Write a protein that binds this DNA or RNA. Structure first.
Ligand SMILES: [Mg+2]
Ligand SMILES: [Mg+2]
Ligand SMILES: [Mg+2]
Ligand SMILES: [Mg+2]
Ligand SMILES: [Zn+2]
Ligand SMILES: [Zn+2]
Lengths: 45, 38, 97, 131, 176, 54, 222, 162
RNA sequence: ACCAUAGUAGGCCUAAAAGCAGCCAUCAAUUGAGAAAGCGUUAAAGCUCAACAAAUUCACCAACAUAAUCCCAAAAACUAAU
């Protein structure tokens, strides 16, 4: 394995793909699952 | 100057230089350390 | 450091070294910065301001020296030797000051 | 020339290796700064102003630091360790006070470092402190 | 102008030697320095000689930073002996335990010397034990019940040694 | 104030008092050994440089 | 950063009482009443006695022959006593007190008339014989440093050697005389009477092997 | 090759480093197994003061010598080439490797006396007035003794003192 | 090149002995510094060495004037030399 590229803000345009895939996971779920997630996060965090 | 056959440094600021075909111990801080190889 | 200390650096106002530490030609400018940021230099005169600008995408190490003769010594040191930069800076500031 | 007469590892170098391994294993914030040749009194004052926040500063020779770093996962830190170096070790990082105490000195520059396996530059450190 | 290290008794402050010439060359008025020394050391009635740092400015003005008193006097007070041994290692100067050394470490942890360093009390106790090593005072791990017997025997041994030393000194003075 | 033995932690009793630690007694993997070796090297340099003519 | 190296510690060295050099007399307590001939064989040739270390570790090795009289003895004694540490070093003589009388004749006397009058005494020293042998818990650099002056002030050429230095030089000489390239050597020619060279040579050259010429010894001549 | 350029524009000094193209080593050396340049190119005991194309490769444009840590020669050959470069400079070869002085080239001096294989400096040797007799003769040294190991096709030794 | 902070004026005699007229111990802090290997003070102070951090060409000794009428063959570093 290796480390990251450690970019700067001069040309900051690349975001990690894990954030985008998490957003897609949230977007691909029905309202009941979103409510269940909200309940679990409120209980734990 | 002092003309000598064997030259040595009497202080850490002396420097040895070859000039005019001879060796010279030159000192700036203490000018009495000026030695010339005969 | 001794060469700068013996030269009487009271006649300088601002010295800034702008560089990117993550490049391959930064050893010389880092050595120059460490030489000018020594204690003998600092106690020679306290009216000077020394600044170390750190960038990431600048990629162009440089040094700017503004001193009270209204003079601006700019030095784009990307391949110069640290000793060469030190001696050039000393010989310019002592000649003009 | 004849083949290589390989050098033998000694207690001091093994101790340095295990020490650096402990450094990169235990603590979280590993900042890389340029060691400025400063006075003893001011250096000790900076040590006190760092220990008030419980952050330590350490120095390791490059001859033993470069090979370990290029073998480890922090090989991106190689350009930072060319000249004089200072490793700032902090458990439970709090970059705000570190930046506050660093701004008090103008010619002591923060080169970079890692905040829980996050290699960042000086601007990244400032952003993390402001966050 | 510079810095001067001066070891001065807590209850004593005189405008004389060795404090005389060292301040006279600097030009600082000795009467003032004695006044502030009395004002700052009148709160301690233990009467322990202490080292202090005098920072003389170029304008003939001076600053005082008071410090923890001397380790030698601390060990002498803890052990009960007026002067240290002449030949350290060949003779025993006194006897203390870890309790006195620990107390000295705690009272010295607040000095200007060990305040900047942030090592634990173990380094301070190591330093005090080394200072006692140079002093000649012997330290034991656990002799609380025997320390009274140790005191009653070492006092006799030390007085006998002092009498022998006085006789030898008198003989040397007569011969010289 | 005479404090009882239970108040004093272990780092008072574990430390040596009488004999200084020597070169062959210490662990070659311990920092104290290298400190003492540096001290002995300084002693060597002082002994060798006793003939300074400057 | 530099690598630490271990110190050779000297624990098996015991400094004896009176480590300083003993005073030597210009004339022995019993003076030689009979004048003797000045034999030069006590200088010519290599030394047979006092060629190895006894209890010390450093020595003054003589590369030539000569005479050591009271002036040289006092010079060496005073120099060693003043420049030697009495707590960590000790010194010893390897040459006896001056015992060979030397006869001198006053100015204005024509030749003949008999032997002169005994003026002073000397100790004959051959090449390869130790003069002062020292030991203790010290290194070789300092003893060499303050023994080179004594060696230089000595009449014959001399050096401040040690056990290791003496062994190194002897092995170097052996290696040189074993890997010598030219087939012709002084030993071979002298022993074989090549070219009838024994007419020019001396009977002692068969033992000297061309390395010793008079009182001078050249270690580079195989 | 690097160059330091200074620009003066209204009380402002700009010092910049410029990197130019540099010639590289030839592709096929006779002895690739040698680490050292001359004695991997098979020129050991072959060069002399006459050989200018080899002496001129590593010298400063002002006639100065180049550091061994940069060149790479073994120490004996570094010393030999230092002596050879001194000999050539004193003999009058390498005409373009002199500093350019517009002021001193107008006041001409005495014509440069032709010389070759000169060992010492021209301004440091005193003339020999006694010259010695047959048995004790003070010779004029010619050439450097470091060049005594060069190949001798004739077989006769090089007379270094005459 | 590179820098030098800490117990501490380590303990005795001496008007003073603060690394240094002298004697005994020669511990111990910071990753990194000897109760101090050389200068200096009446005593200090102060200037250098070795210790870390920065690099790492090689680095032990070896050089020494002279006479008298006028210096004394001239010359020559490579065409093949048992
Ligand atoms: Mg001689
Ligand atoms: Mg330590
Ligand atoms: Mg140093
Ligand atoms: Mg004369
Ligand atoms: Zn000098
Ligand atoms: Zn080579």
């Amino acid at each position: 394995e290796a480390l990251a590229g450690a970019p700067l803000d001069n040309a900051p345009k690349e975001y990690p793909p894990k954030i985008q895939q998490l957003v897609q996971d949230i977007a691909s779920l029905t309202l009941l699952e979103i409510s269940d997630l909200n309940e679990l996060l409120k209980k734990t965090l | 100057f002092k003309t000598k056959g064997v030259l040595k440094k009497r202080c850490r600021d002396c420097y040895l230089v070859k000039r005019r075909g001879r060796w010279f111990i030159y000192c700036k801080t203490n000018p009495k350390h000026k030695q010339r190889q005969m | 450091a001794a060469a700068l200390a013996r030269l009487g650096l009271r006649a300088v106002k601002q010295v800034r070294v702008q560089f990117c530490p993550f490049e391959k030609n930064v050893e010389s400018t880092r050595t120059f910065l460490q030489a000018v940021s020594s204690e003998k230099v600092r106690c020679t005169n306290l009216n000077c301001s020394v600044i170390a600008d750190v960038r990431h995408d600048g990629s162009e190490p440089c040094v700017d020296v503004l001193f009270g003769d209204g003079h601006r010594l700019i030095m784009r040191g990307a391949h110069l030797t640290a000793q060469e930069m030190l001696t050039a800076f000393a010989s310019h500031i002592q000649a003009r000051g | 020339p004849p083949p290589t007469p390989p050098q033998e590892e000694t207690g001091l170098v093994r101790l340095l290796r295990r020490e650096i391994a402990a450094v990169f294993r235990d603590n979280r914030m590993i900042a890389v700064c340029q060691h400025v040749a400063l006075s003893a009194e001011d250096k000790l004052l900076l040590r006190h102003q760092l220990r008030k926040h419980k952050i330590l500063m350490k120095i390791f020779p490059n001859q033993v630091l470069k090979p370990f770093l290029e073998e480890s996962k922090y090989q991106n830190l190689l350009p930072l360790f060319v000249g004089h170096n200072l490793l700032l070790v902090s458990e439970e990082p709090k970059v705000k006070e570190m930046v506050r105490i660093l701004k008090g000195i103008p010619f002591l520059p923060l080169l970079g470092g890692c905040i829980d396996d996050t290699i960042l530059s000086r601007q990244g450190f400032i952003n993390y402190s402001k966050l | 102008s510079g810095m001067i290290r001066a070891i001065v008794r807590a209850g004593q402050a005189r405008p004389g030697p060795p404090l005389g010439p060292i301040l006279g060359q600097r030009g600082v008025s000795i009467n003032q320095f004695c006044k502030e020394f009395n004002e700052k050391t009148k709160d301690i009635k233990e009467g322990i000689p202490l080292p202090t740092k005098i920072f003389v400015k170029p304008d003939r003005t001076f600053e005082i930073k008071i410090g923890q008193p001397t380790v030698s006097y601390f060990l002498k007070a803890a052990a009960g002996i007026e002067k240290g041994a002449r030949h350290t290692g060949k003779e025993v100067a006194g006897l203390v335990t870890l309790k006195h050394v620990y107390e000295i470490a705690r009272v010295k942890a607040q000095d200007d010397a060990f305040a900047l360093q942030d090592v634990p009390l173990s380094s301070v106790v190591r330093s005090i034990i080394g200072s006692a090593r140079s002093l000649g005072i012997r330290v034991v791990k656990d002799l609380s019940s025997e320390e009274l017997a140790a005191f009653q025997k070492e006092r006799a041994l030390f007085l006998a040694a002092q009498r022998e030393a006085d006789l030898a000194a008198q003989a040397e003075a007569a011969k010289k | 104030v005479l404090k009882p033995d239970s108040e004093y932690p272990e780092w008072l009793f574990e430390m040596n008092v009488g004999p200084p630690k020597k070169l062959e007694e210490l662990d070659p993997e311990t920092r104290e050994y290298w400190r003492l070796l540096r001290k002995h090297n300084i002693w060597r340099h002082n002994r060798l440089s006793k003939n300074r003519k400057f | 950063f530099k690598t630490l190296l271990p110190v050779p510690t000297f624990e098996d060295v015991a400094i004896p009482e009176k480590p300083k050099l003993r005073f030597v007399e210009r004339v022995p307590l019993v003076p030689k009443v009979r004048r003797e001939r000045k034999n030069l064989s006590d200088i010519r040739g290599p030394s047979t006695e006092a060629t190895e270390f006894t209890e010390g570790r450093f020595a003054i090795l003589a590369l030539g022959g000569g005479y050591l009289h009271w002036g040289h003895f006092e010079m060496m004694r005073l120099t060693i006593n003043r420049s030697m540490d009495p707590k960590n070093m000790f010194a010893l003589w390897r040459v006896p007190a001056p015992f060979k009388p030397i006869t001198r004749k006053g100015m204005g006397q024509r030749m003949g008339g008999g032997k002169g009058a005994i003026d002073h005494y000397v100790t004959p020293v051959k090449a390869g014989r130790l003069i002062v042998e020292m030991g203790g818990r010290c290194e070789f650099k300092e003893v060499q440093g303050f023994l080179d002056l004594v060696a230089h002030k000595l009449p014959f050429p001399a050096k401040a050697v040690s056990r290791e230095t003496l062994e190194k030089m002897r092995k170097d000489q052996e290696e040189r005389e074993r890997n010598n390239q030219n087939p012709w050597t002084f030993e071979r020619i002298a022993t074989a009477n090549m070219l009838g060279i024994r007419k020019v040579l001396s009977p002692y050259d068969l033992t000297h092997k061309g390395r010793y010429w008079g009182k001078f010894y050249t270690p580079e001549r195989v | 090759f690097r160059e330091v350029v200074e620009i003066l524009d209204g009380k402002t000094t700009i010092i910049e480093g410029r990197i130019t193209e540099t010639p590289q080593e030839s592709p096929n050396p006779p002895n690739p197994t040698g680490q050292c340049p001359i004695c991997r190119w098979n020129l050991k005991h072959k060069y002399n003061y006459e050989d200018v194309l080899l002496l001129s490769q590593f010298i400063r444009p002002h006639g100065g010598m180049l550091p061994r840590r940069i060149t790479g020669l073994c120490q004996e050959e570094h010393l030999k080439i230092e002596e050879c470069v001194k000999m050539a400079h004193r003999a009058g070869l390498l005409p373009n490797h002199r500093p350019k002085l517009p002021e001193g080239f107008v006041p001409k001096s005495k014509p440069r006396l032709n010389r070759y294989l000169t060992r010492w400096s021209p301004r440091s040797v005193k003339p020999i007035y006694n010259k010695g007799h047959r048995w004790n003769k003070v010779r004029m040294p010619v050439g450097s003794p470091l060049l005594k190991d060069n190949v001798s096709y004739s077989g006769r030794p090089l007379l270094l003192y005459h």
